[PDB]
Design a binder for this molecule. Structure first.
Ligand SMILES: [Zn+2]
Ligand SMILES: [Zn+2]
Ligand SMILES: [Zn+2]
Ligand SMILES: [Zn+2]
Ligand SMILES: [Zn+2]
Ligand SMILES: [Zn+2]
Ligand SMILES: [Zn+2]
Ligand SMILES: [Zn+2]
Ligand SMILES: [Zn+2]
Ligand SMILES: [Zn+2]
Lengths: 196, 196, 196, 196, 196, 196, 196, 196, 196, 196
């Protein structure tokens, strides 16, 4: 396939998602008729469609405005970028922060877009490992920088709730490239800097 | 209309859930054939059964080992009891803590039991307002005490993600009974204590 | 006039806002031609249009889903709702948090919509005093509750920057109604509860 | 092309700004006749002139009272210097702190002066990367020292509001020179000190 | 039977304890010949004795130096007294702190001793409800003041471990005597000084 | 003897433990006839069986679903995993956190299970040191990774109660395998992301 | 004599102060010939003129733009307004914060100016107490409000240096006018929102 | 006997203490001849006459500068005043903080002076319950206020080390007079106002 | 002379100290006859033999249980060990915390025992620089490790009160051995690992 | 001229200071007959003397007891020494803290004295650059160790007030001697112990 599905297709799956969600309510042993549940099959459906929109977006139309500042060549960092994704294993959320650092080469992407790349890839059914590696890469390919480093710390409800309610159970997953990858003195500066 | 769906009543729909989910994924724009979504409809099917595993429980039996202390009549408080529940509108987790306090008459409920109570009502498609009241009731009922006062604070994922990504939006819901309802110097004492 | 202007009208004022913003760049003593400034007249214009969208929205189409829970009648609170508005005196931002509390009567509005009312009124050219009073009112009229209380603490850049750079210079502006207005014991519970 | 626009050069456009703003408001959907927007185009006109009041200043004269200490050559550091600047793309404030450190050769700049430097470059339509470098330069230049190292951390309102309301998104930008650039055990010392 | 059991009985109860713990080790499915548990019966025996030495002490022999300053008739407080105890239900540590607040009448108890009255009552198989009230009274007896107010906060390990990991769930109890019981301005004013 | 001892061995040893404790209550100088310790032996016994169930679980057994990701070769870490456990020397709880880190080879382990491995070993008569090296290994061997890094910190109740009262007395213990051990860089960078 | 002393009186007294200081440097046993104190008198003199410029400003003068809002009758507060000042007893800085609160009548004062009133009085040889009652009044009289509440906390350098070294020694001083004074409720609720 | 004992007496005192220590250095188990102890009986000799200098000092020569400001009649608070005393029971330190609050009438004492007063009594062989009443007292006589409010808090070293080794163990002692004593709404506003 | 001095000697010591205090109570300016001082020479008498009990204790009867675990050879850290000593220079307390780190070889000492060792030297007339070396020492001899790493931190009461009244004034003292001494990459990882 | 100027010159320089300050008062446009400034010349005179008493002291008379422990050759640290000083440029307080780290050789300086070397150098008209280096050297001289490392952090009031309110702007300086200068592992390890 490939191509990102827009509002048209999403506008049609509503009834089937609605129904998929109606069938569920009954199976949990619930009475779909309560005043509450009443319009849930649509809301839920309608909602699920949101935590998964990164699908109908492409890193190209999202790109653009990658200012050719060049004149700098020194570690830019955008920390604490908020992220809310969907565990692809049990359709449950895992939410956290993302930090990014790079060694611009000739180009330097606007800051407003780095928080965007994070959204194109987070609003999908993901695994943390991959969301990370995907952001880093998009950044590289688009900016062609000397080195990119992405570290993602997030809490998963799959843990925090089912199985065993272990709050804190924060998992961090990094992906270093180039200078960050090769040179540890740099990678060291990155980490010991995303703290404060 | 009664009947706490049991093991076979669970095992009978699991495959039904599995299906409605296998649907959803397709209706989502994904491909249930990848490695991650191969086993999801079950992982999910099963997950969701967990978060609504409070339906099959009864306060009656859940009760007991409720010591006839009596000779105290001096406010007992169990705070920071962690809670995890499901929004019944979009079916998105909402998490927080529940605090509870009372004035033992002739009975003083086993400590652990207070958290068990909190657990039967949260593991259900809920609404914070109601979830707060039910707990508070079950205690009034199962302990016929001088006064009850339950306060729940939990952060919603419905808000925090979709709509208007507002974290920090902690919605607090109180519910007082008896002495707590009437005597406000008792109520005013409770709140200033469920803090430090 | 009255009626809220949508994307059509906004789609036409772009060139005049663009130009209004081009004329400015030159007047600040800047060379509109730099690689940077180059597409700013459109971005800025495009942006200004965002911090002011609460105009094209109406508290009616935004309302709906004001669940008739009724059965409760005890202080609901949604604290820490983030807010980012525009000083109507010098077109500079003032950003902060909003807290809301009420005594539901027969109806109880979904939580997802309270954070919404805040947005319909904050994305406009405002004064803090008014943004506050407007939220409170919308809530009242829509929910017909026993009492509503809104407190808004925000920092203004007009201060924090020009004039005299006084960080912290946080201003709080409250608006109590009904029970909150009349009864101070209640209003007391509210405030001493939006803290923690 | 040189010439730090002065008083008359300011007073000549103020009315021009006032107009372009009186426009904007109308082009916005507002009514410049209300009481608040009556005097805005000036308040704004004037405000904006303030935030770009660094154009009319020169590091040359701004310099001086730069003591010929010399006999130290041991790292001096002025941190937490508060900064306030303007995004040159959407023209939305971005605020933070700038930290600076060096190794006095034969000259040691007056303390206050370091902050004055920081002030000439921030009060302009800027871009954080550049704003960081300029400061660092002006110091290398005006002090011909062994090594300079400037680090700016500031939160952007462009992000924080529009696009994807991400607060906490603090983007840090470093820029080292001389010993700092080369000697990393000096650079590594700086960063671990601009903290506590 | 009363009468304290000392190290002559605390040496005449050990080998029995060693035996029982030695039995436990096996009934638990371990090998009591392992390096680790080689002398564990003796240790856990000796430990158990320690945790329950409070029995072998008489408040009266704990007292003595109960100075007759008399002149003060103003609230004294001894906060954050560390308290380690043994849940008599499962014999599992519940730990916390105590806060004491009396109103001197004719004698002020030597401060260091308000800490002893604690170890006499906590070092025994207990219930929080009682650990509390006991400490109050004891004081009341040994001083004959105008009012005594005791609040204890403890986190029972039976919960934080068995039952299924519920940390935080701190439990707070209070036994007000005299003024504190009656004069509320006093009780409350007490509870606002035990927080900072 | 080996062979996982299931709920069967236990269902018979319980009444032994129950009797063993009965012994202890009297040996402690208490009365097994009070309403309190009247059933204590069965609670205590039963409780002891819980804190030592890791015995009845086989690592291998719990694995199953070690998704074959391979594609990463970038450190995955899971901090703040809670852990409660027993001291084999005196049989007193010892609790704290466990943070694990590893360098996926061809296989990556589902994060949910990375936390189960900890409970199969924490639920036994342990010694931090051992408890540590065990998780380390059980993981090397389950994922055949380029490297494992495991660190635990916990407060032993033995110290913080008996013996002395020396609280805070947290004890940390590392155990790096593979690269974490070899390459001293990866080991240090682990150690930093586990602070954050 | 009164009459606001402008930059004129000062432009002549400076060389007096400058000479006065010259006196002091030598009286201190120092040398006014070192490179340091070589120009100190003119810096010191000049500096002293700055810390006492509130003299040359008239409240009335700074007002002008007390927007006629009226429409509110709901407490507006402005906390954390910074303030630096001089001790008239020893002429040593004393610094801290100022938090103001009032109940708008027909007029509401632009928040920017609510902070200027503080600098016209903080910039003089003051005594906290006085400095306080002054802002209070200058505000009653400028907005003719239902009530004013003003509170200041600051560390006097006299104590924290000379005399002793007693640091922290922050001193607070209230001064309620109108309702804040009368109605003891509004006064208390002020006092709480200024903590938050 | 009264009448202050100055240096002329402390001098004649230094060798009877010096010996009193060369005796307790020996009767200790130590060999008072070493390098470290060679001078302890005199070092410690002068240190004791130190912690007890508050004796030879009268608040008649200490008061003075009891400024006749008056026209304030609004509460004045001097918190976090550092205080360090001796346990007259065991000659063991016990350091802390003194907060003082009063209502001016016809006189307002200079703040510098409020600290000097806490010292005159804080430097003696004292009793916390006592050290207070005096400090509060001196003030009603030396200023004839409307009512004083002193509250002290300190950690006694007699329990922290010997006894049971309990830290944190803060003991708050208060003494209210005039309005503070009689009018609670004041007393209260006082306490809550010294926690900031 | 060596050989420990027990109770039989401390007893014969209690009256030569008691007098040594009834002399320093008098030669102080106080009247040792009161109610409070009536017993200070004996209360304080036994308190001194207390803070100096570490003398009559040998680590031969203190060690024991030097468990032959071995198979760990991974760093073991026991931080925040509470320690309280006496300034042999002035007989003034000085409380703090001791952190100990070592590399097991063929033996791992039980943690409970690590604290008991800090006490044997911590309870004597000491020197911080000294109290360390010994604690670190005992360990290389009592465990023949790969290298110890002790670091102590405490606030001496000799400066805090007498001298200049300086709080916070922490004095950290360290002593590295074996690997710790020689191998920095370890020494380091040690320090950074005890700050958590 | 050298030779310290004492209270015989400190009484022979007062009336001159009183006069000059009395002159300042007038040149400042105030009335020296006001109750407040009635005796202000004398006070500010006396104060000034205090702030500059460091001149009248000789390091050599400050020393003495410089114990010869010799045996340690391990880093000692005296952190957070409170420091109040006088900017010789405008004679305006700059305040902060000091951290000292030496490597004992043959003698350890009596701790309390490392605080004195401070007050001798800070209590004078100073520059931070120098206050620092001086304290280093001084130590170096009076001890002849292997390395001395001094870092001072101060917030100059000339900035935080004059120039236009720039708080935070803390300034940090460091003078490394011996090992610290050379052996970096030492310098850095120093700077990581002066943070926690
Ligand atoms: Zn998951
Ligand atoms: Zn929802
Ligand atoms: Zn504004
Ligand atoms: Zn921007
Ligand atoms: Zn229990
Ligand atoms: Zn143990
Ligand atoms: Zn003063
Ligand atoms: Zn004592
Ligand atoms: Zn000392
Ligand atoms: Zn200066």
């Amino acid at each position: 396939g490939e191509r990102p599905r827009s509002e048209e297709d999403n506008e049609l799956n509503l009834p089937n998602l609605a129904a998929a969600y109606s069938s569920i309510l009954s199976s949990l042993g619930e009475n779909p008729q309560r005043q509450g549940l009443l319009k849930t099959p649509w809301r839920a459906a309608s909602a699920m469609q949101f935590f998964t929109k990164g699908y109908q977006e492409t890193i190209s139309d999202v790109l653009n405005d990658a200012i050719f500042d060049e004149d700098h060549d020194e570690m830019v960092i955008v920390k604490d970028i908020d992220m809310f994704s969907m565990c692809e294993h049990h359709l449950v959320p895992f939410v956290g922060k993302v930090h990014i650092g790079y060694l611009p080469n000739k180009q330097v992407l606007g800051l407003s877009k780095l928080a965007r790349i994070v959204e194109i890839y987070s609003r999908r059914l993901q695994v943390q490992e991959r969301l990370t590696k995907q952001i880093a890469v998009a950044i590289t390919e688009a900016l062609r920088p000397a080195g990119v480093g992405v570290v993602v710390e997030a809490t998963h409800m799959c843990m925090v709730m089912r199985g065993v309610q272990k709050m804190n159970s924060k998992t961090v997953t990094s992906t270093m490239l180039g200078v960050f990858r090769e040179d540890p003195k740099t990678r060291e500066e990155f980490l010991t800097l995303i703290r404060s």
